[PDB]
Every structure is written in C-alpha cells, then in structure tokens.
Amino acid sequence: ALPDVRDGLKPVHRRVLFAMDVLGNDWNKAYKKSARVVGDVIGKYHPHGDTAVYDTIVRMAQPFSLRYMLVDGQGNFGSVDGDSAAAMRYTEIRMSKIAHSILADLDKETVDFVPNYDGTEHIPAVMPTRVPNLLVNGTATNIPPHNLTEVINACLALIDNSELTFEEILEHIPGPDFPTAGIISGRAGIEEAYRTGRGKIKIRARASIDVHETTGKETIIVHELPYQVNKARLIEKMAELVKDKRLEGISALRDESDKDGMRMVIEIKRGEVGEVVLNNLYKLTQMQVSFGLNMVALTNGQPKIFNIKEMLEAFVLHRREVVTRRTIFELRKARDRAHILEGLSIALANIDPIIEMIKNSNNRKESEEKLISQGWELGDAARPEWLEPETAEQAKAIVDLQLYKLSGMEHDKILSEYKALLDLIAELMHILATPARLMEVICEELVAIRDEFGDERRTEIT
Amino acid sequence: ALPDVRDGLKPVHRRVLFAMDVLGNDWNKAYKKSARVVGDVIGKYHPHGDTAVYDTIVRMAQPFSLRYMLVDGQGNFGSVDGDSAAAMRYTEIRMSKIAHSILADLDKETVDFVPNYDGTEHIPAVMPTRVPNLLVNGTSATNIPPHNLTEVINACLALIDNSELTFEEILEHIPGPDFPTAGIISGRAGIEEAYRTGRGKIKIRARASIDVGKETIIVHELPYQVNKARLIEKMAELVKDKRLEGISALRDESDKDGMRMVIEIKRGEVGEVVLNNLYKLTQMQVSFGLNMVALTNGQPKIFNIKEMLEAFVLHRREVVTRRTIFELRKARDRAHILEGLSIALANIDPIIEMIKNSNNRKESEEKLISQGWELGDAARPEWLEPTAEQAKAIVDLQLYKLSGMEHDKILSEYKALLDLIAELMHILATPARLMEVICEELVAIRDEFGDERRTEIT
C-alpha cells in the first residue's frame, strides 16, 4: 500500500494510532504494555496475527527511523545495528505529544469514518492532522523526512501568497533533513526532485580527524551515518576492505557507540594520511550512499507523483476542510445546547407550578406532555435548524433535571452558560461566513505547532 | 499447567471465558468474531503471538472435543477428520448456555480476583461454577476423561445427604466415563481402580454392526480423540500391503447427520474375525490411562473421585455463603436509600425550599443533615448509627420521580427488599438452609443440562 498524501499514513498506521487514542493511551498518562495496543488493533481493526501491527508500533518509536516519532516508547526497540525490538510483552508504549496533533478534533466530525472488518466499529479514513506528516516523516515511493520548522514556514508563505514559486519554496526548504543527520551534497538533485517528483542526492557521514597530542597519530571518528545505514554491517564491510588490502592506511577498527552517541573509531597507521583514508572510506563503503527521491502518495484513491508545491497544497487544502467541518459541527452543538438551557431557564424561572403535573401524572412519559400541551410563561440565529416555528426535547431536559439544580449558583450556572453560548454561536458564524477569519484560524494553528514542535536542522546541505 | 480441581480450568481457559463474559459475548446475543475475543485475551490477560488462545477457543467449541461445550460457534471449527479451524477473522463465537453457569455470580464477590501480567487489570483465580466441570468435561501430565452431567450431579446430591458415601455407592451413580463421541468401554476394574486411586487403564472400542449376499462392517461411532480420516487411510494401508485379511472395499460415507464407515467382506471369510483384527491393529480400539491430577491451593495432587466431588461441593459451600453475605449487605444499603427517598417524598414541597435557599450542592446536603424531618431494625446497614448518604440520594433525585407511579415504585422496592433481607438472614444462620440452596441449584442444572448416557460400559 501507499500512504495518503494528506496525513501521510498507511491504513495500519491509523488503525494503530486510532486504537491508542480510543484507549486513552495518551502522552501524559502511564505507559501501557505494547501487547495491550496490539490486542485492540487485532481485535477491532486489523484481524490478522502478523507482526505488521507490532512492527508498525516498533518503527514509530525509533528515533533513527522517524524525524518526529509518533510513539513514545520505553524498552528495547532495536538499533541502527539492526537488532530487533524485544517481545510485545516487554515494551511499554504511549502516544507522543506530536501524535495528538495528528489526531486533534477526531471527535468533531472532521474526517470520514468507515466501517471495520465486521461492521461493529468505525475508523477514520484519514487523520485531521495539524502536522504535515507526509513530508515531515517521509514515507512505489521514497519520500525523505523534512524539517518541521521549514515545512510550516513554506506552508505559511504559501497561504500568504498562493502564487509561491518553486524557487521561493527552496529558500524555506533547502532540502531533506534526516533524523540520522549527516551531509547532503547533491544540491541540484534537490531542486530536481522538488519541481519534478524525481531526483537523486548524495548523503555523506559526518567524521572528524583527531591527532593524539603526543604521538601525532591520527584517528578518524565517525559521528553521523547516512539514513538507513546499518552501523554494524558497515564496520564489517570496512574490516573486509582492509583484509583484502582494498583499503590501505588503517591499523584498527572499533565501535564505541552509545545509548548516548555514535563513536566509530578508525585508527590511522603511523605516517599515512588521515584525509586520504577518509576520502577512500567515502568511495568504497556506505559511508556514502545515493537516495532516490520518488514522491508518490494516494490523493483521491489514486497513486500520483507530486511536486513539492502540490504536497504543500494538499496539506493546506486538508486543513481548510477539517477546520470548516469542525466549525460546522461546533455551531450545530452550540445551538442544541443553547436550546436545552433556554428550555431550562424559563423552567427555573417558574419552578413551583412545574413541580406538580409531575405529582399528578402516573408515569414519566405522560408527565412531559403536560409541558408540551400547556403553554409556558416567562421570566433568532440560535435556534437549531431541526426546530419548527413553535418541545419534547426540552421537557426531557426538565423532567430529567436533578433536584439539586434549583440551588442558587446552579441556576446562575445554567444561564451564564446559556448566555455564553450565544457569544459562541455569533463567533462561530463569522468564522464560517468569512474565508479570511478561517485562514486566520489555520495560520494560528500552524504557528502553534511550529512553536511547540519546531526544532533545528540536523543534516548539513553542501 | 494443570486445571484447578474446583472449576476444571487452566489459566488460558479461564482467561478466555472471563474475556467473553466481560465483553458481553452471551449465549443470548449476537455472535462476535473470534478475532475480537482473541485480541482481548492477548492484550489484557495473555500476551503471546501464540495460537494457544485461538486453539483454546476452537477446542471449547467442538462437539467431538467436549462432553458439554463451553463455546457456541458459527463457522468452520474443524472436524473428527482433523481439518483445521478457519482463521479467527472468519469464525464467529459466543458463550454457550452452560458456560454462564460456570461463571454465575462472579459479580457478587464469590471468588478471589488477581492481577493480570502487569497491574492495570484484575482476573478471577477460579470460577464460581455451579457445574462440576473437572469431571464433566475432563482434562488432558493429567488425563481425566469426560463424564455424564446427570450422573455426577446425582453423585453430589447423594454426597450431601451422606458424607460417608462409599466408593461402591458412587459407582452406582457414576459407573464410568461418558465420552462426547459415544463408544464402548470394557474393563470395569480399571474404572474402579482409577476411581479409588487416581490411576487406572481402560479400553475404548468403536461400535460397529455386522450386516448379513455377503457381509459388511458398519462403524457408527469411534473411540474418543481418534481421527476418522487418519483411520480409514490406516485401514487402506493395511489391506494394500496385505497385512489385513478379507476386505473387498472401504468407503467413508459419514455426513452432517452421522458417521457411517463401511468395510465390505470379500466372500464369506467372516466379519466377526475381521472386526477383531481390526480392533487389534487400528485405532478402532485404543487404551486410556486415567491419571487424575489437579491443583488445590497450588500444588498438584492425585485425587480419588470422592475427593473430587468433595472439592466441588466444598467450593459450592464457600461460593454460596459469600454470595449470600454480599446480597444481604447490598440489600441493606439499597433499602436504606429507598426509605430515605420515601421520607423526602410525602415531605417534598418543604424539601424543595432548602436546595432553593442554597448557593451550592454541598450546602444543600448540609441542610438535610442539619434538620430532623417528619415521617408519613435488622434491615439497616452496619455502618449506620442508631442520613447523609440518603440525602445524596435526594439532592440528586430527578424531577420526574415526584410522579404518581415513580412514587409507588420506590415504595414497592423498599417493602420487597425487607422480605429479601429477612430470607437472606435465614440462609446465612442455618447451615442446613444453605445446603438446601445448593441442592436446589444442582437439581436446576441437572434439569436443564443433564442428558442421556452416550458411552456403553461392559
């Protein structure tokens, strides 16, 4: 499968995340065992028995895999050395802070829900992301990760001026940014893939030469490797090139890497040239690789090659749709709550005669009719739309009202809210009526996420 | 692992049934996909990418596996011919009726719960089973064969009327196992040795008839646990290598409604002798080693049948006593709220006024427990001095409850709850009255689930 261009996810990815959201498996709350989440996924959404689900969980918690993890996990989840994560019975998991911004407003009829494999539960067909995840974590296809700050910037620049040229896009996004860092060098390959959808670049490892102060001996220290390069396979390919005399000048190889940092160690035979050895390392091993940017995603059920402006367009169109649906929904809800409070405020303004008719009725069904059949004394854009020019719904709210509601501040609470709901409806319609207030809301959301999640660039571009 | 001697279940058995009960997968309601149950078990009570769980589920639903099925399934769950079940995403499940009887009163603090693999969830250590599942459904080391529910229940009634019940008297109610697959047992000594000791060996024959024109052997039922497909092919190998006598042909004409293995006899050469070399060279006859072991306080143990009935009845003594303690305590509290609700009513209009005249709910309450109203013993909760709680039930009572017949139902319930706590006391104080309730229960499952003996003992 291919991921959706709007939220950047594949079906299994959403099923996992939605499951964690339904479980209250939040970033503030206590970690839950991975098994638990795998259980609800298999149970309600991916009825299979594989390790697709677990692998998906594992992949989303690896900092060397995602430029912005979606899963905050504790325990053994593998390494750049390619070792495996421990069993689902032994890893703890929970959503990451940024993952919630991808699920924001799921409860406000923002995206279409579909039925699950048996028709007893439903799943969003797409996430209401405030984050341009597809570009940011990257993803036939081969889209590399990017920097959240740069992408939001392009997004803002794009809302302020839709005629944005590719050249301007590049001032904002100079190129990819891997979680793994490194150095990109294929500068025209970047623009190539941005205007076209297809390009090829060179990713190089970061390395420095130390000179031992007393022996003058040289050592090369590899700090950063290119995206996806297995560190241990790389030291093996290196040991080999030394064995076959295909790589001269090295007297010793060691990994001294940590849970805290990478430290590959390549000793330089006395007299040989550090720089030259480094240059030969870059020609014979995965110290250097090619990356083919081939940017395909599903737009409206179909594979498509995208240029970078289109990717930015898709994300922004999707934000217009989610914010619009969100506001439609909030306005319907506010009118329904306003209608019930109103019905309770005249009820509370004459609570004593209201007391009988409850006394004089022989069941609850019939109590109510004495309220829809007699007409009450007292003491518009806020009317629900399902509401006829003249109800049962209100009487349910009175007849089912708790005795303690007559209390002084309760009364005052059910009418400040009522009153506050009338400002809400007013505010809500401005936003829907006015294209500008709406884009303004979208712009504050983008600035908000850029503020909370924006970070430095990691990969250097030469 | 071994099964608990009280409910006859192993941890996963119990973990699976508890999941279905919690999930509302009742014998009554719509079938759920097995995968919904499997996933719940794995995530909440048994974290393994095994098939132990799905496997536990399929076995519980095979009429040929269990004498009294614990799961009612729809879809392909295998067959006596050895087919696999269909995948868990295609098969449907629900607890069988008798299953609710093994779980009855898990809601009334009858059994000790316990932490699951992490904290976060709790699960029963045993089921409050009104069914002696250990014997009735048996267990597979350990190797306890199934038995007839009607026979075991009677062995229990008898044990209740006389705890000096002899082994000899037990044999009259339970002459031996009763497999879901019928068949014929031979060798009574094995049965008596095993019942008295915990270890015995018996022989289990298929039931076949010989039709007398030549002769043909018709097999109607096979010994327990033998695969029909493996068997016919075994017979075919024997006749093809000429290691087995006068058989002109063999067909399996078994269908949805019953078994019919047919073996035709060459021409004379007599079927009574072919049947015999057939019992001797194939799974037409198999032997069964009774080894009745189970846990009791942890720790395996070899049990004699009397000890098994004693364990089950004793467990019923504990469950019912606790269930009654719970009901009594629960009925005192409920009755204490309804008596209040009744004094708030028929003294209402004034009550209205208090909540009226208060800037809060906590203060409405306080002026309920700072008044003595007007009106209009062994039924009182034990934390009650000679009420605040009753007034929480007032302050939060819904307006429509001041209605004519809502008014009559809190009063009716009150009264009816007074007779129930009285009955509840009679049972807790009188040992004999408690044993009556147990007998009433055994008779009840026996009348609903007891059935005809299937296996013949010779």
Residue B258 host element (H or E): none
CATH class of B328-429: mainly alpha
- Pinpoint the residues of chain A covered by CATH 3.30.1360.40: 197-294
Residues B205 and B185: their CA atoms lie apart, in Å, by: 6
The alpha carbon of residue B3 and the mean position of all alpha carbons in its chain are separated, in whole angstroms, by 13
Provide long-range contacts, Cβ within 8 A and 24+ apart, for A222-225.
Answer: A222/A262, A222/A263, A222/A264, A222/A266, A222/A287, A223/A261, A223/A262, A223/A263, A224/A180, A224/A181, A224/A182, A224/A183, A224/A262, A225/A80, A225/A180, A225/A182, A225/A262, A225/A286, A225/A287
Whether B130 contacts B156, CB under 8 Å: no
Residues B454 and B334: their CA atoms lie apart, in Å, by: 48
Q: Which residues contact B99 (CB under 8 A, 6 or more apart)?
A: B17, B20, B27, B70, B71
Residues B449 and B451: their CA atoms lie apart, in Å, by: 6
Q: Which residues contact B362 (CB under 8 A, 6 or more apart)?
A: none
Domain at B1-197+292-327+430-458, CATH from 1.10.3720.10, 3.30.360.10, 3.90.199.10, 3.30.1950.10: 3.90.199.10
- In DSSP terms, B252 is beta-bridged to B261
Residues A18 and A114: their CA atoms lie apart, in Å, by: 13
Inter-chain residue contact A404 with B364, CB threshold 8 Å: yes
Retrieve residue B324's tokens: 């009654």
Mutate to test the interface with A, among B400, B401, B408, B410 (most CBs of A within 10 A): B400
Q: Report the residue count for chain A.
A: 462
| A263–chain B nearest CA distance, Å | 37
Inter-chain residue contact A403 with B35, CB threshold 8 Å: no
The alpha carbon of residue B390 and the mean position of all alpha carbons in its chain are separated, in whole angstroms, by 40
Inter-chain residue contact A41 with B39, CB threshold 8 Å: yes
Among candidates A368, A333, A376, A369, which has minimal Cα distance to A351?
Answer: A376
Domain at B198-291, CATH from 3.40.190.10, 3.30.1360.40, 2.30.110.10, 3.40.50.300: 3.30.1360.40
Residues A219 and A216: their CA atoms lie apart, in Å, by: 10
In chain B, which residues have their Cβ closer than 8 Å to the Cβ of A42? 35, 38-39, 42
Breaks (C-N over 2.5 A) in chain A follow: 139, 379, 390
- Pinpoint the residues of chain B covered by CATH 3.30.1360.40: 198-291
**C-beta atoms surrounding B403 within 10 Å:** 23
Among candidates A186, A137, A194, A207, which has minimal Cα distance to A291?
Answer: A186
Retrieve residue A413's tokens: 């609470």
- Of the partner residues A32, A47, A402, the one whose CB lies closest to the CB of residue B89: A47
Q: Is A228 left (phi over 0), alpha (psi -120 to 50) or beta?
A: left
- Of the partner residues B39, B351, B400, the one whose CB lies closest to the CB of residue A39: B39
Dihedrals φ, ψ of A362, to 5°?
A: -95, 15
Retrieve residue A127's tokens: 């996430």
Among candidates B377, B371, B324, B319, which has minimal Cα distance to B347?
Answer: B371
Q: What is the dihedral of CA A254, A258, A260, A264, to 10 degrees?
A: 20
Dihedrals φ, ψ of A425, to 5°?
A: -60, -45
Mutate to test the interface with B, among A344, A365, A403 (most CBs of B within 10 A): A403
The alpha carbon of residue A284 and the mean position of all alpha carbons in its chain are separated, in whole angstroms, by 38
Residues B78 and B61: their CA atoms lie apart, in Å, by: 10
Cα end-to-end distance, chain A, whole Å = 34
Residues A47 and A36: their CA atoms lie apart, in Å, by: 15
- Of the partner residues A88, A351, A359, the one whose CB lies closest to the CB of residue B47: A88
The alpha carbon of residue A292 and the mean position of all alpha carbons in its chain are separated, in whole angstroms, by 25
Among candidates A290, A307, A309, which has minimal Cα distance to A192?
Answer: A307
Inter-chain residue contact B89 with A48, CB threshold 8 Å: yes
Instruction: Calculate ∠ Cα B300-B304-B307, nearest 5°.
Output: 80
Inter-chain residue contact B404 with A362, CB threshold 8 Å: yes
Query: CA of B350: which chain A residue's CA is closest?
Result: A352
| B345–chain A nearest CA distance, Å | 10
Whether B69 contacts B95, CB under 8 Å: no
- Pinpoint the residues of chain B covered by CATH 1.10.268.10: 328-429
Superfamily holding A331-433: Topoisomerase, domain 3 (1.10.268.10)
- Beta-carbon pairs below 8 A across chains A and B: 137
Q: Which residues contact A185 (CB under 8 A, 6 or more apart)?
A: A201, A202, A203, A204, A461, A462
Whether B13 contacts B56, CB under 8 Å: yes
Residue A282 annotated to the active site: no
Residues A401 and A358: their CA atoms lie apart, in Å, by: 12
| B389–chain A nearest CA distance, Å | 15
Query: CA of A44: which chain B residue's CA is closest?
Result: B36
Inter-chain residue contact B360 with A408, CB threshold 8 Å: yes
Q: Which residues contact A47 (CB under 8 A, 6 or more apart)?
A: A117, B33, B35, B39, B88, B89
In chain A, which residues have their Cβ closer than 8 Å to the Cβ of B49? 49, 51, 54, 88
Instruction: Please tell me which residue in B90, B117, B224, B279 is annotated as part of the active site.
Output: B90
Breaks (C-N over 2.5 A) in chain B follow: 140, 212, 376, 386
Looking only at the bridges linking them, the beta strands covering A183-184 and A460-461 are parallel
Retrieve residue B318's tokens: 């504990």
Residues B356 and A404: their CA atoms lie apart, in Å, by: 8
Dihedrals φ, ψ of A297, to 5°?
A: -150, 165
In chain B, which residues have their Cβ closer than 8 Å to the Cβ of A118? 33, 36
Q: Is the dihedral of CA A53, A55, A57, A60 positive or negative?
A: negative
Q: Report the residue count for chain B.
A: 458
Residues B278 and B262: their CA atoms lie apart, in Å, by: 13
The residue type at A288: Q
Residues B441 and A280: their CA atoms lie apart, in Å, by: 86
Query: CA of A359: which chain B residue's CA is closest?
Result: B403
Inter-chain residue contact A407 with B355, CB threshold 8 Å: yes
- Of the partner residues B48, B120, B359, the one whose CB lies closest to the CB of residue A408: B359
DSSP state of B320: H
Inter-chain residue contact A408 with B117, CB threshold 8 Å: no
Classify burial at B61, counting beta carbons within 10 Å of its beta carbon; exposed 0-12, middle 13-18, buried 19 or more. buried
Whether B296 contacts B302, CB under 8 Å: no
Crossing angle of helices B404-429/B431-449, nearest 10°? 110
Whether A266 contacts A222, CB under 8 Å: yes
The residue written with tokens 């608990």 in the block is B4
Rg (CA), chain B: 29
Query: What distances in angstroms separate CA A307 from CA A177, A193, B105, B106, one per listed residue?
Result: 17, 7, 64, 61
Cα end-to-end distance, chain B, whole Å = 34
Dihedrals φ, ψ of B258, to 5°?
A: 155, 165
Retrieve residue B288's tokens: 């069964």
* CATH 3.90.199.10 is held by the domain A1-196+295-330+434-462: yes
Query: CA of B354: which chain A residue's CA is closest?
Result: A407
- Of the partner residues A35, A87, A404, the one whose CB lies closest to the CB of residue B395: A404
Whether A67 contacts B59, CB under 8 Å: no
| A50–chain B nearest CA distance, Å | 8
The residue written with tokens 């570009």 in the block is A135
Whether B54 contacts B75, CB under 8 Å: no
Query: CA of A36: which chain B residue's CA is closest?
Result: B43
Query: CA of B33: which chain A residue's CA is closest?
Result: A118
Among candidates A325, A346, A378, which has minimal Cα distance to A112?
Answer: A325
Query: What distances in angstroms separate CA A116 from CA A3, A15, A19, A319, B87, one per listed residue?
Result: 19, 10, 12, 25, 17
Among candidates B427, B412, B404, which has minimal Cα distance to B334?
Answer: B412
Q: Is the dihedral of CA A390, A395, A396, A401 positive or negative?
A: positive
Instruction: Please tell me which residue in A90, A117, A194, A282 is annotated as part of the active site.
Output: A90
Inter-chain residue contact B397 with A402, CB threshold 8 Å: yes
Inter-chain residue contact B39 with A37, CB threshold 8 Å: no
The residue written with tokens 């499997």 in the block is B38
Classify burial at B166, counting beta carbons within 10 Å of its beta carbon; exposed 0-12, middle 13-18, buried 19 or more. exposed
DSSP per residue, B157-185? HHHHH-TT--HHHHHHH--S---TT--EE
Residues A342 and A355: their CA atoms lie apart, in Å, by: 18
Dihedrals φ, ψ of A410, to 5°?
A: -65, -50
Q: Which residues contact B170 (CB under 8 A, 6 or more apart)?
A: B155, B158, B195, B305, B306, B309
Q: Is B202 left (phi over 0), alpha (psi -120 to 50) or beta?
A: beta
- Pinpoint the residues of chain A covered by CATH 3.90.199.10: 1-196+295-330+434-462
CATH class of A197-294: alpha beta
Retrieve residue A189's tokens: 């390959």
- Of the partner residues B118, B351, B402, the one whose CB lies closest to the CB of residue A359: B402
Residues B4 and B17: their CA atoms lie apart, in Å, by: 15
Residues B423 and A153: their CA atoms lie apart, in Å, by: 76
Residues B22 and B41: their CA atoms lie apart, in Å, by: 11
3-state secondary structure chain A: CCCECCCCCCHHHHHHHHHHHHCCCCCCCCCEEHHHHHHHHHHHHCCCCCCHHHHHHHHCCCCCCCCCCCEEEECCCCCCCCCCCCCHHHCEEEECHHHHCCCCCCCCCCCCEEECCCCCCEEECCCCCCCCHHHHHCCCCECCCCCHHHHHHHHHHHHHCCCCCHHHHHHHCCCCCCCCCCEECCHHHHHHHHHHCEEEEEEECEEEEEECCCCCCEEEEEEECCCCCCHHHHHHHHHHHHHCCCCCCEEEEEECCCCCCCCEEEEECCCCCHHHHHHHHHHHCCCEEEEEEECEEECCCCEEECCHHHHHHHHHHHHHHHHHHHHHHHHHHHHHHHHHHHHHHHHHHCHHHHHCCCCCCCCHHHHHHHHHCCCCCCCCCCCCCCCCCCCHHHHHHHHCCEHHHHCHHHHHHHHHHHHHHHHHHHHHHHHHHCHHHHHHHHHHHHHHHHHHHCCCCCCEEC
Dihedrals φ, ψ of A273, to 5°?
A: -90, 115
Among candidates B368, B370, B334, B332, which has minimal Cα distance to B348?
Answer: B368
Residues A425 and B47: their CA atoms lie apart, in Å, by: 49
Crossing angle of helices A308-349/A148-160, nearest 10°? 80
